[PDB]
């Protein structure tokens, strides 16, 4: 009697505790059903998969520089001195059932985590979800992004590899020693000595499996709690206002679709871990200061920092008996990048004057200057990433390596400007298109007038039509406009039988008019609620 068991368990729960009101509030919480609001969930799900795979990895990983000869199964690396970290990474890859798959899905989850964090940041920035109520949310999310970047750095640096080791040597060691007053001291504190200090990988292992994941988990908890209680913002729409949330309740629909989305994200990541090879360390010999490779790139989320290193033009200053190497330039650049990213909402409000409580998102077209600035920043980030990749770009796409370096150097001040101008004008022209639709109706096929030979596109008005043909223009309300009669009530009733065979006409008619009734009922309910809010 599962129904009786459920009832008895509910009564016992509500007697021991009293979660009825709280649970009802959680279940009844309404979440907007916009697709772009799942971008953060992608990052959350990738993070969960990262935790689950990282536990498995830590069950088999040994962090240490203790030198050992492999003497494993992988023949191409036998008798070669390597760190125990590399040896156990190879053991995970080869000598544990499914360890290669687990580590590959872990790395793919890391890449998807960074990518989805970037996409979510783009969504919120361009939609203006950081304004008065949620600047703190933006700030903690920026800290979260920085932590994710650096944890991925430490994660692919954990198995001491040739690629990851040379990346560490460059970024960490060089840029740390570069810092003027405390650079060498920071280097010695972090590595416990010179660069190959025998505590580096244990320290990174701790930072990567316990410390940084703990901070990220706490910050994700704060992030999700803030989103939960500062009810999720929404785009302007029929019944959507600054003081309501139009969407679906948590329990019946949102919970089911979020769980299913998590399942599908897990499936995508597992499929990638299977079919796509990620970081094949066995091809990469154990780290040695002398051995190198041509590629020498970090993961894509640090590729922009590496590209900054490459592109910045070798400007070194030599104060009285001292040196200020080119690494400090990039250190300051990264500092500026993070500072501006964290402080943008406050910069935005200082610049514009907006101190209003904003609960309705802005369309990126509707906010041109911010959209232009975001496009400019994305262009700069892409230029830096492809500059880091300039080695492989030059190799495959036959471009001189010097040519790619200087393309990056010039474009990091030219391409941002071009993209800013283009994005600003593009946003304004999207606004112009929206107003054209508002004032003339949707466009359709052309018709030749009866008496004379005029051609008229035979538009379709979206609002009340004047006594004559031309309609009364509507007022823009911040919501997207249907520019195709495709997406309106036109040409949308295929035979509802099946792909290969029809259904009885009575069934088809019943279904089609039932759907018509349901959709017009939804439209009428939204219209009535909209009229009720002010009217």
């Amino acid at each position: 009697d599962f129904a009786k068991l459920a009832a008895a368990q509910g009564d016992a729960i509500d007697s021991r505790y009293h979660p009825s009101a709280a649970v009802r509030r959680q279940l009844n919480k309404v979440f907007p059903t916009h697709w772009s609001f799942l971008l953060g969930e992608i990052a959350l799900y990738s993070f969960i998969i990262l935790l689950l795979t990282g536990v498995w990895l830590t069950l088999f990983f040994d962090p240490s520089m203790a030198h050992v000869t492999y003497d494993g199964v992988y023949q191409p690396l036998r008798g070669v001195q390597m760190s125990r970290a590399y040896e156990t990474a190879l053991d995970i890859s080869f000598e544990v059932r499914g360890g290669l798959f687990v580590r590959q899905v872990h790395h793919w989850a890391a890449l998807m985590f960074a990518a989805s964090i970037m996409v979510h940041l783009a969504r919120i920035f361009f939609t203006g979800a950081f304004r008065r109520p949620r600047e703190a949310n933006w700030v903690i999310g920026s800290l979260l992004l920085i932590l994710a970047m650096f944890e991925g750095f430490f994660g692919y640096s954990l198995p001491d590899d040739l690629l990851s080791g040379t990346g560490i040597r460059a970024a960490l060691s060089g840029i740390t020693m570069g810092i003027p007053v405390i650079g060498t001291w920071m280097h010695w504190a972090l590595f416990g000595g010179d660069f190959p200090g025998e505590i580096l990988i244990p320290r990174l292992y701790a930072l990567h499996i316990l410390l940084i994941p703990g901070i990220i988990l706490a910050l994700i908890g704060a992030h999700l709690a803030l989103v939960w209680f500062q009810k999720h913002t929404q785009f302007p729409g029929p019944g959507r206002t600054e003081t309501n949330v139009v969407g679906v309740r948590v329990m019946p629909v949102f919970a089911v679709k979020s769980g299913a989305f998590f399942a599908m994200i897990t499936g995508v990541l597992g499929l990638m871990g299977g079919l796509l090879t990620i970081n094949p360390i066995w091809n990469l010999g154990p780290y040695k200061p002398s051995q190198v490779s041509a590629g020498s790139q970090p993961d894509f989320y640090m590729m922009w920092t590496d590209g900054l290193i490459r592109l910045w033009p070798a400007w070194e200053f030599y104060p009285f008996g001292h040196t200020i190497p080119q690494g400090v330039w990039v250190a300051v650049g990264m500092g500026l990048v993070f500072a501006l990213l964290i402080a943008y909402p406050f910069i935005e409000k200082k610049v514009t004057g907006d101190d209003a409580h904003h609960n309705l998102l802005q369309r990126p077209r509707d906010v041109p200057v911010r959209t232009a600035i975001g496009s400019m920043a994305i262009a700069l980030y892409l230029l830096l990433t492809f500059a880091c990749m300039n080695d492989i770009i030059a190799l495959k796409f036959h471009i001189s390596l010097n040519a790619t370096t200087w393309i990056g150097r010039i474009g990091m001040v030219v391409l941002p400007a071009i993209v800013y101008f283009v994005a600003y004008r593009w946003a304004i022209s999207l606004q112009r298109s929206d107003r054209e639709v508002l004032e003339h109706g949707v466009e359709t096929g052309i018709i030749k007038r009866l008496p004379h030979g005029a051609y008229v596109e035979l538009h379709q008005p979206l609002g009340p039509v004047d006594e004559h043909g031309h309609p009364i223009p509507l007022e823009y309300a911040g919501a997207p406009l249907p520019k195709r009669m495709n997406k309106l009530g036109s040409g949308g009733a295929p035979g509802t039988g099946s792909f290969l065979f029809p259904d009885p006409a009575v069934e088809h008619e019943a279904l089609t008019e039932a759907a018509h009734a349901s959709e017009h009922k939804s439209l009428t309910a939204l219209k009535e609620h909209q009229d009720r809010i002010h009217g």
Binding site: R24, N28, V30, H67, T69, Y74, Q75, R78, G79, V80, Q81, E95, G98, F101, T166, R169, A170, A171, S173, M177, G178, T184, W188, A189, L190, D194, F195, P196, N244, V245, V246, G247, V248, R249, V253, V256, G259, F261, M264, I265, T266, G267, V268, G270, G273, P289, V292, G295, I309, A314, E316, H322, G327, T405, T496, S498, L511, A514, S518, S522
Partner: protein, 382 residues
């Protein structure tokens, strides 16, 4: 406007759901089932579709279990029967797992989009500026806690608590971080000129005056005799060889005392050097640095492999251009001239090792680098 003391008994499920929405500030508008018409076969087809997706997920999960437990996993040497099975083993694990969970997710999404009823529930958002009753009551509670405590009236306690907390925090933070803090300039590495700091000294620093440091070539032999003495004739015009600072005392790796000295030589960050043979025809284009004019032994030039910018090895030697390129950040150093950077982030030349030949003709270092060899840092160029 009443809590429904006894009407809940006869209130139906729909009425109770509406009441809950009302209490929570949620008004459910157009909660309509997906299949109002009963008995239609489109409903059965959609049912079968979601069932097929869920069953595909289950079959793929069973496939994951069967392949995981029973498949030719385990590395297979090159060109051996079973290599193909091993190579597509992990792909099969990932394919089965991902397909299973993805199909389950697709089935769940289809159930939500086809069977779970459609709603446009609208929740009243009470964001911002809690009602004045709550605000003023919280303010009163906090202010009463602060003032009643009699703080901001015991000046001595106010200052003493601040001093105590500040001193304790100072002591605790300093004791937390002093374990990590180390002096980079503590003289530790022994040298002919007494113990010196690590950054100044590399494997090429003479431990005692007049020590012989051979430019030993690092044969890839796994462990035994990894470094072997080197001769100028071994290199030929337009050739580069990575050499290391090997000492007679640092004999082959057969012993346990050795194979730690050799491991230290191999793992020395500032140890590896590139010995390049400048072509005799191109020897006339060489421009030499101050104090490094006699460093080259005839047409042999020894430059540190560590890039002068962030310290990656600069191994990519290009002959017929005499350019030592670094792969980490694409910086070229003109080997013909003193190895000065002529492109890329680097701004300082690579340190040039003084080389010569000892008795028996083996290549040895004729001294130490006249400058620190790794990447630059604050305490440099003086």
């Amino acid at each position: 406007g009443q809590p429904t003391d006894a009407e809940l008994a006869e209130m139906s499920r729909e009425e109770l759901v509406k009441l809950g929405g009302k209490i929570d500030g949620v008004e459910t508008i157009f909660k309509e089932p997906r299949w109002p018409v009963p008995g239609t076969k489109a409903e059965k087809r959609t049912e079968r579709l979601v069932a097929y997706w869920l069953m595909l997920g289950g079959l793929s999960g069973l496939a994951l279990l069967l392949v995981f437990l029973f498949w030719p996993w385990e590395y297979q040497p090159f060109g051996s029967e079973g290599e193909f099975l091993y190579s597509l083993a992990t792909p099969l694990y990932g394919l089965t797992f991902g397909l299973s969970i993805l199909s389950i997710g697709i089935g769940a999404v289809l159930f939500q989009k086809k069977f779970i009823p459609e709603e446009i529930s609208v929740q009243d958002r009470h964001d911002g500026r809690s009602p004045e009753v709550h605000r003023k009551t919280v303010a009163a509670n906090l202010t009463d806690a602060l003032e009643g405590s009699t703080l901001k009236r015991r000046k001595v306690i106010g200052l003493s608590l601040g001093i105590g907390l500040g001193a304790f925090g100072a002591g605790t933070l300093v004791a937390f971080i002093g374990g990590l803090i180390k002096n980079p300039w503590k003289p530790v590495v022994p040298t002919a000129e007494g113990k010196k700091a690590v950054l100044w000294t590399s494997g090429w620093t003479p431990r005692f005056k007049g020590e012989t440091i051979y430019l030993a070539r690092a044969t890839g032999r796994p462990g035994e005799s990894p470094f072997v003495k080197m001769r100028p004739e071994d290199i030929d015009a337009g050739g580069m060889e990575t050499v290391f600072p090997w000492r007679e005392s640092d004999g082959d790796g057969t012993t346990v005392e050795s194979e730690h000295k050799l491991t230290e030589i191999a793992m020395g960050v500032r140890n590896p050097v590139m010995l390049i043979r400048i072509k005799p025809a191109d020897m006339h284009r060489v421009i030499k640095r101050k104090g490094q004019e006699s460093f080259n032994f005839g047409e042999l030039f020894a430059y540190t492999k560590v890039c002068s910018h962030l310290g990656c090895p600069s191994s990519l030697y290009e002959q017929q251009t005499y350019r030592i390129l670094c792969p980490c950040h694409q910086s070229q150093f003109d080997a013909l001239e003193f190895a000065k950077p002529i492109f890329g982030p680097a701004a300082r030349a690579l340190a040039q090792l003084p080389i010569t030949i000892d008795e028996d003709g083996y290549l040895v270092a004729n001294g130490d680098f006249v400058e620190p060899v790794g990447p630059a840092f604050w305490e440099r160029k003086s």
